[PDB]
Amino acid sequence: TYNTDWAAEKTKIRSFFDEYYVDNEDGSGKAFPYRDQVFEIARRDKQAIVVNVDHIKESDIPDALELSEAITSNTKRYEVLFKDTISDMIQDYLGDKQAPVIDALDAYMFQRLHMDRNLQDKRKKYPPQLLQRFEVYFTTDDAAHETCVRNIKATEIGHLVSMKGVVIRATEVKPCVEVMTYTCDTCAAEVYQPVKGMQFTPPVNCPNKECVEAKANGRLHMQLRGSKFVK
Amino acid sequence: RLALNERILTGPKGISALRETLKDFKPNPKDDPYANLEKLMKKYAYWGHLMFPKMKTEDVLNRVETLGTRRQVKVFMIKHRL
DNA sequence: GTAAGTGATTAGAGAATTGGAGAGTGTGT
Numbered sequence A: 001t002y003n004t005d006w007a008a009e010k011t012k013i014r015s016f017f018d019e020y021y022v023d024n025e026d027g028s029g030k031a032f033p034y035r036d037q038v039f040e041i042a043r044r045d046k047q048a049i050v051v052n053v054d055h056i057k058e059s060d061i062p063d064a065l066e067l068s069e070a071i072t073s074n075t076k077r078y079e080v081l082f083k084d085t086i087s088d089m090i091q092d093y094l095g096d097k098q099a100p101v102i103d104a105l106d107a108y109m110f111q112r113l114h115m116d117r118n119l120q121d122k123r124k125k126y127p128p129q130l131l132q133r134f135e136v137y138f139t140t141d142d143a144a145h146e147t148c149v150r151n152i153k154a155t156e157i158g159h160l161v162s163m164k165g166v167v168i169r170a171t172e173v174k175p176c177v178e179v180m181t182y183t184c185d186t187c188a189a190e191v192y193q194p195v196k197g198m199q200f201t202p203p204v205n206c207p208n209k210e211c212v213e214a215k216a217n218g219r220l221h222m223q224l225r226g227s228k229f230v231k
Numbered sequence B: 001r002l003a004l005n006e007r008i009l010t011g012p013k014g015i016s017a018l019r020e021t022l023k024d025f026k027p028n029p030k031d032d033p034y035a036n037l038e039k040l041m042k043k044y045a046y047w048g049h050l051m052f053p054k055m056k057t058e059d060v061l062n063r064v065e066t067l068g069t070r071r072q073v074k075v076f077m078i079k080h081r082l
Numbered sequence C: 001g002t003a004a005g006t007g008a009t010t011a012g013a014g015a016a017t018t019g020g021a022g023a024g025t026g027t028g029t
């Protein structure tokens, strides 16, 4: 009684990005603003897309209501599918060109992918949080999702919720770990560990098969030029 | 168990790999002999580290000097000198 | 003195004894 065919859902999501439009104010044509924002990410003038679920709900597309309900009911999963479809759209726009290097992690990734050269290998070697470098956020305006702090209870876990309130306390911005990278002493291999939640446990012993078979006992040392941080 | 032995010493990580490592080494005969010795000794250490990482360079060279008495290694050297 | 044959020595292989490393499992905090 569950659906896990991700390719069909990706097809639906990409059809939304292709076919949502707004008419030009002079009547000269149509704007396709979501794919314009995707191309802004592709040329690196941007870092995030904010998607309005009510636009999906009121779009002139088959299965639009079902897609909106699925997004609202399991939002923590559909973020991954939106990131995957935007990554495929970025590669279709970009072609054989390269996106510009702007920071040390971009320089490390662009240098290391061609060191590896000198899709199965890419997706097995690198986690998707490191391969994809943009943010996706959702919004709602319909009053069905309006609630108070008092009303958010056990039925709302995992769902998208909207509310309105006053800010009492706020901290300053801190660096938060997203992906750690370790390198072995003896065999010079690398380990990538993605982090979820507010804790992580670092691995100790090298997992690479040649190092393990040789019993070289190489330690793992963490490196922050390859590791990923977020505000 | 795991130990350095005649299969490893005659295998693709062994004496042929050391020969391939030594092909680029060309000391100057008019230079300091101790300096030339230092240059040679660290190439021995590099080959030993690739060939058997568990053990110190000193113990690796002692084990190679021991294993030279085996008949299999002698037959390998008889073929290899040609 | 030289050549051929036989005896002795040396080298390799097989079998048995001794010891130490490594891994697994159990117990205590």
Ligand SMILES: [Zn+2]
Pocket (backbone or CB within 6 Å): A184, A185, A186, A187, A188, A189, A206, A207, A208, A211, A212, A218
């Ligand atoms: Zn290693």
